[PDB]
Amino acid sequence: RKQVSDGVAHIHASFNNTIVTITDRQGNALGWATAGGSGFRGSRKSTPFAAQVAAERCADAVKEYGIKNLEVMVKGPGPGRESTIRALNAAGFRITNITDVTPIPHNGCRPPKKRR
Amino acid sequence: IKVRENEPFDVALRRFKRSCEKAGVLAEVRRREFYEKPTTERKRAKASAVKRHAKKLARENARRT
Amino acid sequence: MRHYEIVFMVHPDQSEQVPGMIERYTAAITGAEGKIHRLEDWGRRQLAYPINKLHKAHYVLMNVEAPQEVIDELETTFRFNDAVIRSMVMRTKHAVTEAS
Amino acid sequence: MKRQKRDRLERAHQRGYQAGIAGRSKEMCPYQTLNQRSQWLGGWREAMADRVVMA
Amino acid sequence: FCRFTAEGVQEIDYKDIATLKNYITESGKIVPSRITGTRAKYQRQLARAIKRARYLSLLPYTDRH
Amino acid sequence: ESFAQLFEESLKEIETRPGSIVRGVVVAIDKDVVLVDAGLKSESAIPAEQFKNAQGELEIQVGDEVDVALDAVEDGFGETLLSREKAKRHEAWITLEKAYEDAETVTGVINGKVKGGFTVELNGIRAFLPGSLVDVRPVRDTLHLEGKELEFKVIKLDQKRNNVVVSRRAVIESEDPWVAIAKRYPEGTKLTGRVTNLTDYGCFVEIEEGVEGLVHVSEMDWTNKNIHPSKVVNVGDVVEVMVLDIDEERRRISLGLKQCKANPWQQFAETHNKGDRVEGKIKSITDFGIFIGLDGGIDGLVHLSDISWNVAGEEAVREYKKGDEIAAVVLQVDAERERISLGVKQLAEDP
RNA sequence: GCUUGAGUCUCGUAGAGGGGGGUAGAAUUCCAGGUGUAGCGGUGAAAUGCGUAGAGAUCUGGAGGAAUACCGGUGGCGAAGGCGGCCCCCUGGACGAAGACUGACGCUCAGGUGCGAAAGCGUGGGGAGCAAACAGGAUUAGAUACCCUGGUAGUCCACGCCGUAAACGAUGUCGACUUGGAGGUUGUGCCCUUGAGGCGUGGCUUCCGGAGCUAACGCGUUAAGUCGACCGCCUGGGGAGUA
């Protein structure tokens, strides 16, 4: 429980799901909540609203660590990614800075061939 | 991308630069190596560019409105 | 002869050996009938990104005129040294003066 | 048997919104009069954001 | 637009990062010649200078280092 | 013979390209189109608005002579760029004389700073200057009688981009755009800029020494989408605009224009938003939950179905009030965010 | 004999032209460790699959392989195939300015010789990611398929072979002549470089159109226009580019 002050809020924002991992400055996790585990299932995981409910259900169950202010990292080009940080302005936090950690390779490995 | 500033901030600047270069390169690179149709899609894109420029230019005569 | 524009970066807490290193290296070039046209040391400055978990390296610019076998032996001596991180040798064509 | 619904003004809006969402990044299927082209393009640019928020 | 390398008599050196930082964006990406409006020859010399300065760590590759 | 050749080089010698030689005689007037003939290919389609002086009415009948401008030839059919810019050169000459004179004395009257320098207006035109230029010292013309008469003593001019800040009162006292793009930057520095071409998404006001601004369509007014910028402002006109954004890479200064009648809306929220002031307003379209009175300069959606009488739910406003009629309605709430004033009509005398 | 065709020399110029060597950053995968716990992943919906043996996420370190974001340009170079991080070494071609030099040394070319994407084959390495075959889950009336989860050859390197492609501009090479416009790229000359300026000049290239041509579509000074030299090829469709 550790009585931490500030945290780093990683938001993995893929197409089929958003998971929200609130950690500390150090980089080791304090609590996470996903858009799947909030009652939304299958296609309904892939909405911004499930990301908002995920950010709520993380922002409490990190209450016991006592975080006043947090940074926001967002990885992934998904349908959440903005409603989930409106849901961290509204959850009672002070947003220090917001970054983008979406991995853009200087094209390396080959992508899959997926669609027809 | 990286937004930090004083108390009116945090949304518009970030969704601007984030949304443009992020959604561009990730929505591109997410699948389809293709090896062949960036050539076709750039050729069609730029032929459509010169056809749109000349088409609007000679379409700048009249429209009877 | 061939011109070269050597910029080599130096591991920071071994930077007091740098005036020795410059004397050994331009002594090695000068021992083979080669001129020199620049000596510009930029001092300990800040790396844009960490090279081996390490910031703030000490940069030396040389910009020498020398033959090929001498510049090749010199580049091998830049390899086989743990004090030297990221050497670089560059183009020919009419070596130049003050830059920064 | 009665008269036309929202006389092309904010029907021109939702045509540009549906055409904005379903691709059509032409912005080159509008009307030609100003009061209807302005919000065909208005619905188009309001539909680009609603394409970014979803798949 | 204007080409500042054409306004000078320059041949782009890779060490004036005061000038090269006018041609990287704040994400490290090289800015297009349709934006800066440089000539194509100085655009190629510019790109080699940016990549070379990246190799000597006088410029960053990205902003996530 | 060589009469014609000599004649040609003669006529080359007795004209120049810019609007310099006052040569076009006004040979037909009709509202709203003036037309001249300065010895060029065709006759200009002149607006009337390059020729009315300082109060709105025309000044020049048939035969009168103003030079126009040039260096642009044939857009299909026709000849010029407007003579009003012509005038700018004359203004520049007078400013040069003052700089040249060592000083320029006219009248300058500067009430306030859009972007940190009082605005000075000379004859027909009004110019914007940096904040210091208006006053010699710390005197400040806010305490001076409004729109006062002095002259202008020049404080600062930007020499490329045209901004001139001039010296009111105190008679006794006597590559290139983009490196240092921090002058008009800081958040909201208002500028006076002529618009160039309105591209159906934009307006392209761009004045400050070789830059490009947009003011695209979203602000422009206090309506969003139905606006069509050609209807709402102008073509070729110097306006209220400020930066709102400068992007260092991508070279897109994204100016705005709503920083104006936004204030009128705020005043409406306030002016009549002090408490519960009564307003006489006309309904425009009743949408089954209200009546939408929209008098008083663009204040949007208003009275809800809940009040309307002293009965709650059954009322259906089309039965009870009108279409297009001026009523009692008082304010009851102005919400500063989300732009919702919520008037009412139950505040009357039945109970 | 002559110099216009062709070729050589003195200066430069740009270029993903080729061969060899080296090195940099981001990312993917795996392994070891930390924090942490109930899901992850995927779809049009789902399930197979992975996870309480601690997954997914997050951080630190390490290994290995492959490709080089931005610049990136109906841009560049190459006979064609093709060639994109950066640096070095060895090396081919093109272009232009001013001269000098040789003096028809030229063009094409059956047979022949050489180069020749990808797949594939042989030998030896290497194997991240992807991915035929294959397994499983779906879908479907069926589904040896598209979709999903995995996954071996192959993709990579060195040395040989194969010698085919919608190897396409579906347009053999070389040369001459014949109205224009808008661009790109690359040299160069003069003048007020006095200002990103103006007037010409060569090369390569993109589009639009003139006469002319064509069955039309369209081509249009880089012709499918007018001609010349040489070569390859065609003679109804199927059988058959098969025996």
- DSSP string across B28-45: HHTS---SSTTHHHHHHH
Measure, in angstroms, how far nucleotide G147 C1' is from residue A116 CA: 8
Q: Is residue C98 part of a domain?
A: no
Pick from A69, A78, A68, A116: nearest CA to A100: A78
Strands (E), chain F: 24-25, 28-30, 33-35, 46-47, 65-66, 119-122, 125-128, 154-157, 164-166, 193-194, 238-239, 281-282, 326-327, 334-335, 340-341
Asked if residues A107 and B34 have their Cβ atoms less than 8 Å apart, the reply is: no
Q: How far apart are the first and last CA of chain D?
A: 40
Please indicate whether, in this complex, the C-beta atoms of A110 and B33 are within 8 angstroms of each other: yes
Q: Is residue C99 part of a domain?
A: no
Of all nucleotides, the one whose C1′ comes closest to residue B42's CA is: G74
Tokens 């009175």 sit at which residue? F293
The chain A residue lying nearest E61, using CA atoms, is A106
Asked if residues A43 and A12 have their Cβ atoms less than 8 Å apart, the reply is: no
Domain count, chain C: 1
Residue F126 marked ligand-binding? no
Q: Is residue C100 part of a domain?
A: no
Give the Cα separation of F37 and F67 in Å (integer).
Answer: 10
Q: Is residue C75 part of a domain?
A: yes
Two structure tokens written together for B18: 């984030």
The chain C residue lying nearest E58, using CA atoms, is C48
DSSP class of residue D42 equals H
Range of the domain at C20: 1-92
- From E13, E52, E60, residue closest to C48, measured CB to CB: E60
Largest CA distance in chain D: 40
The chain E residue lying nearest B1, using CA atoms, is E27
DSSP class of residue A100 equals -
Taking CB atoms within 8 Å and a gap of at least 24, the contacts of C34-37 are: C34/C1, C34/C64, C34/C65, C34/C66, C34/C67, C34/C70, C35/C64, C35/C65, C35/C66, C36/C62, C36/C63, C36/C64, C36/C65, C37/C63, C37/C64, C37/C65, C37/C95, C37/C96, C37/C97
- What b-and-e string marks burial along D20-49, b requiring 16 or more CB atoms within 10 Å of the CB? bbeeeeebeebbeebebbbbbbbbbbbbee
Closest approach of F180 to chain E, Cα-based (Å):
11
Count Cα atoms within 13 angstroms, Cβ side, for D2: 2
Chain B positions in Cβ-Cβ contact with residue A102 (cut-off 8 Å): 22, 26
Two structure tokens written together for E46: 């510019």
Give the Cα separation of C98 and B45 in Å (integer).
Answer: 46
Could you write out the three-class secondary structure of C21-83?
Answer: HHHHHHHHHHCCCCCECCCCEEEECCCCCCCCCCCCCEEEECCEECCHHHHHHHHHHHHCCCC
Q: Is residue C6 part of a domain?
A: yes
Asked if residues D19 and D42 have their Cβ atoms less than 8 Å apart, the reply is: no
Tokens 């309105």 sit at which residue? F198
Phi, psi of C66 (to 5 degrees): -160, 160
Please indicate whether, in this complex, the C-beta atoms of D54 and A79 are within 8 angstroms of each other: yes
CA F171 to chain centre: 31
Identify the bridge partners of residue F128 per DSSP, sorted by sequence position: F119
F 229-268 residues inside an 8 A Cβ radius of E = 248-251
Give the residues after which the backbone of chain E is interrupted, taking a C-to-next-N distance over 2.5 angstroms as a break: none
**Pairing label, strands F119-122, F65-66:** unpaired
Q: Is residue C51 part of a domain?
A: yes
C39 touches chain E (CB under 8 A): no
Taking the C-alpha atoms of A37, A38, A42 and A46 in order, what is their torsion angle to the nearest 10 degrees?
-110
Closest approach of C96 to chain E, Cα-based (Å):
11
Give the Cα separation of D6 and C91 in Å (integer).
Answer: 71
Pick from D30, D31, D33, D32: nearest CA to D19: D30
Asked if residues F249 and E26 have their Cβ atoms less than 8 Å apart, the reply is: yes
Give the Cα separation of B56 and B41 in Å (integer).
Answer: 22
Give the Cα separation of C55 and F196 in Å (integer).
Answer: 50
Please indicate whether, in this complex, the C-beta atoms of D37 and F227 are within 8 angstroms of each other: no
Chain B positions in Cβ-Cβ contact with residue E29 (cut-off 8 Å): 21
Method used to obtain the model: cryo-EM
Q: Is residue C85 part of a domain?
A: yes
Give the Cα separation of A22 and A59 in Å (integer).
Answer: 8
Chain A positions in Cβ-Cβ contact with residue D21 (cut-off 8 Å): none
Asked if residues C61 and C6 have their Cβ atoms less than 8 Å apart, the reply is: yes
Please indicate whether, in this complex, the C-beta atoms of E31 and F250 are within 8 angstroms of each other: yes
Q: Which CA distances in Å does F18 have to A1, A3, F68, F95, F194? A: 78, 75, 7, 19, 19
Cβ count near C8 (within 10 Å): 24
Reported structure resolution in angstroms: 7.9
Q: Is residue C97 part of a domain?
A: no
Closest approach of A113 to chain B, Cα-based (Å):
5
Residue F140 marked ligand-binding? yes
Q: How many CB pairs under 8 A join A and D?
A: 7
